[PDB]
Structure 1
Amino acid sequence: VKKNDLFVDVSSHNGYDITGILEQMGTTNTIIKISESTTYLNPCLSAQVEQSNPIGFYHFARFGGDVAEAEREAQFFLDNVPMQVKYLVLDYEDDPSGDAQANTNACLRFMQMIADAGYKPIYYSYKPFTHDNVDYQQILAQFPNSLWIAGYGLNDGTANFEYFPSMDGIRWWQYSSNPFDKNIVLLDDEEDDKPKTAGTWKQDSKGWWFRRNNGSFPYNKWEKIGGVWYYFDSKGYCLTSEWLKDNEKWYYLKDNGAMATGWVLVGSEWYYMDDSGAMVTGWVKYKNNWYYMTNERGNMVSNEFIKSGKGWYFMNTNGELADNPSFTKEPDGLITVA
């Protein structure tokens, strides 16, 4: 998954049929509960898996601060993972021992075993519970950006950045449980490896071109190099700091030729590109601020509204906010948090 992608998490509480909530949510991405303690298994697992695209599975911890118990729970969990997924989640939110360090050590052992089995570990919980029972910084020290924190605020079913859990290393945010657990991704999955490199970059007066291993080079086309997309002109030089409409969609090649994805500042205007690099029109919220963007006839426009208090203020591209809010009732656009 990538920044701002959505996913639903379920357990037996959601039943043997979750097609409905996946339709509502608008995604098939899921993190399904497999086990609890060393003796419980979610009976709806196989059905929920069959009906979705799991990106991970979670375990409800009952080991408190007992490392030995944590190890047995992790193995039970592992022994029941039904298919390969990138992530395995440790849901630590109940039965904490009175000793926060012991709690931390138990959680660390649990996560270490998940990593040893070839998966990416995740620590799931609530901020106040985490604040009172573990030293989350010790967890991030061993497992960077591995947090999945729940914080609903009004819990009205929508993502309201105003109540975003403030903590370091948050990978995913469970922003509501109304009517079902809803989550938004804050960071792209890690890919840290060794870029294949199918050629060598060459720079000169005119710019950068790419000499493929066989001596040829891309031109008049898109081409992924080192995991990044670039568009090369008819002469083989990749475009830089430039808009490009291709197949009825607008893309932006940044100063380094890299295709823009997510939010991107062009000049002094903010635009949002989907994971495919294609520009998104209309209302898109970036954290607390709203943007209405259009590209009618190639005329790129970004209307910015900065939040202040309970209102959103229009900002003329000549950096000047109106004296009064343009709106207090947010539009129903795309909500992004990163």
Structure 2
Amino acid sequence: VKKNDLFVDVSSHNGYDITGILEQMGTTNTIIKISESTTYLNRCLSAQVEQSNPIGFYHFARFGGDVAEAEREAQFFLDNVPMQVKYLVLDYEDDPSGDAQANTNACLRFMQMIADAGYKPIYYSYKPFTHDNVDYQQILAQFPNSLWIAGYGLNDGTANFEYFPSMDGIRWWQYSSNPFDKNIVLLDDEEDDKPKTAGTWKQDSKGWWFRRNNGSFPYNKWEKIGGVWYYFDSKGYCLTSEWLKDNEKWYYLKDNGAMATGWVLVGSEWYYMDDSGAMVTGWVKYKNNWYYMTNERGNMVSNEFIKSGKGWYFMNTNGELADNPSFTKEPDGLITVA
């Protein structure tokens, strides 16, 4: 998954049919509960798996500060993973021991066994509980950006950045549980490795061109080199800092020719692109600030409104906010948090 992607988490509480809540949410990405302690298995597992696209599974911990118990739970969890997924989550929110360092150690041993089994470990919890019962920093030192924290606020079923949990290493944010558990992604999944490419980059007075292994080179086309996309001139030079209309959709190629994804500052205007590079028009919120973007007839416009208190103030590109707010009631657009 990519930044701002959504996913739902479920357990027996959601029953053998979750097609409805996946439709309401608008995604099939799910993290399903497999086990609890060393004896409980979520009965709806296979059904919930079948009805969605799992990105991970979670275990409800009951080991407290006992490392030997955490090991037995991790193993029971592992022995029941039904299919390969990138993540296996440690849901630590109950029965903490009075000894925070012991809680941390058991949590670390649990996460370590998940990592040794070939998965990316995730620590799930709530800020206050984590603050009182463990040293999440000691966890991040061994497992960077491995946190999945919950923080609902009003819990009205929507993502409200005003109540966004402040902690380092937060990978996922469960922003609500109102109807069902809703989560939004803050960091792209990792992909360390994939070294070398299928050619060599060449630079010169005219810019950069790519010499493929066989001597040829891309031109008048898009092409994925490394993990990123680029568009090449009819001469084989990749575009830089430029807009490109391709197939009725707009794309922006950054300073390094790399196709933009997510938020990107062009000049002094903000624009938001699909995970596939296509510009997204209309209302889109970046954290606390709202942007109404449009590209009709190729006229790129970014209407910025900075939040201040209980209001949003329009900011004319002349660098000045109005004296009074433009709106105190947020529009119903795409919410992004990173």
**Normalising by structure 1, what TM-score?**
1.00
Aligned equivalents of 2:31, 2:146: Cα separation in 1: 15
Shift of 1:166: 0.1
Aligned equivalents of 1:245, 1:137: Cα separation in 2: 45
Aligned equivalents of 2:245, 2:172: Cα separation in 1: 32
Q: Can you list the C-alpha shifts for 1:167-209, whole angstroms capped at 9, x where unaligned?
A: 0000000000010000000000000113241000000000000
Aligned equivalents of 1:246, 1:131: Cα separation in 2: 49
Shift of 1:12: 0.1
Q: Can you list the C-alpha shifts for 1:96-115, whole angstroms capped at 9, x where unaligned?
A: 00000000000000000000
Aligned equivalents of 2:268, 2:194: Cα separation in 1: 35
Aligned equivalents of 2:165, 2:179: Cα separation in 1: 20
Contact 1:64 1:106 in 2 (8 A): yes
Aligned equivalents of 2:310, 2:202: Cα separation in 1: 52
**Normalising by structure 2, what TM-score?**
1.00
Aligned equivalents of 1:193, 1:255: Cα separation in 2: 24
Aligned equivalents of 2:242, 2:95: Cα separation in 1: 55
Query: Partner residue of 1:262?
Result: 262
Aligned equivalents of 2:136, 2:234: Cα separation in 1: 52
SS in 2 for 1:65: coil
Aligned equivalents of 1:45, 1:196: Cα separation in 2: 40
Unaligned runs of 5+ in 1: none
Contact 1:65 1:97 in 2 (8 A): yes
Aligned equivalents of 1:28, 1:249: Cα separation in 2: 26
Q: Can you list the C-alpha shifts for 1:126-176, whole angstroms capped at 9, x where unaligned?
A: 000000000000000000000000000000000000000000000000000
Contact 1:210 1:236 in 2 (8 A): yes
Shift of 1:293: 0.2
Written as runs of structure 1 = structure 2, the 5 A alignment for 1:1-338 is 1-338=1-338
Aligned equivalents of 1:248, 1:190: Cα separation in 2: 31
Shift of 1:241: 0.1
Q: Can you list the C-alpha shifts for 1:70-117, whole angstroms capped at 9, x where unaligned?
A: 000000000000000000000000000000000000000000000000
SS in 2 for 1:142: coil
Contact 1:5 1:184 in 2 (8 A): yes
SS in 1 for 2:81: coil
Unaligned runs of 5+ in 2: none
Aligned equivalents of 2:210, 2:318: Cα separation in 1: 39
Q: Can you list the C-alpha shifts for 1:292-311, whole angstroms capped at 9, x where unaligned?
A: 00000000000000000000
Contact 1:195 1:227 in 2 (8 A): no
SS in 2 for 1:32: strand
Q: % of aligned pairs identical? A: 100
Aligned equivalents of 1:181, 1:325: Cα separation in 2: 33
SS in 1 for 2:88: strand
Contact 1:61 1:92 in 2 (8 A): yes
Aligned equivalents of 1:202, 1:195: Cα separation in 2: 18
Aligned equivalents of 1:134, 1:141: Cα separation in 2: 13
Shift of 1:63: 0.0
Q: Can you list the C-alpha shifts for 1:214-252, whole angstroms capped at 9, x where unaligned?
A: 000000000000111000010000000000000000000
Aligned equivalents of 2:78, 2:304: Cα separation in 1: 48
Aligned equivalents of 2:102, 2:273: Cα separation in 1: 45
Aligned equivalents of 2:232, 2:274: Cα separation in 1: 21
Contact 1:2 1:189 in 2 (8 A): yes
Aligned equivalents of 2:22, 2:136: Cα separation in 1: 31
Contact 1:32 1:48 in 2 (8 A): yes
Contact 1:259 1:277 in 2 (8 A): yes
Aligned equivalents of 2:166, 2:42: Cα separation in 1: 31
Contact 1:156 1:178 in 2 (8 A): yes
SS in 1 for 2:141: helix
Q: Can you list the C-alpha shifts for 1:31-70, whole angstroms capped at 9, x where unaligned?
A: 0000000000000000000000000000000000000000
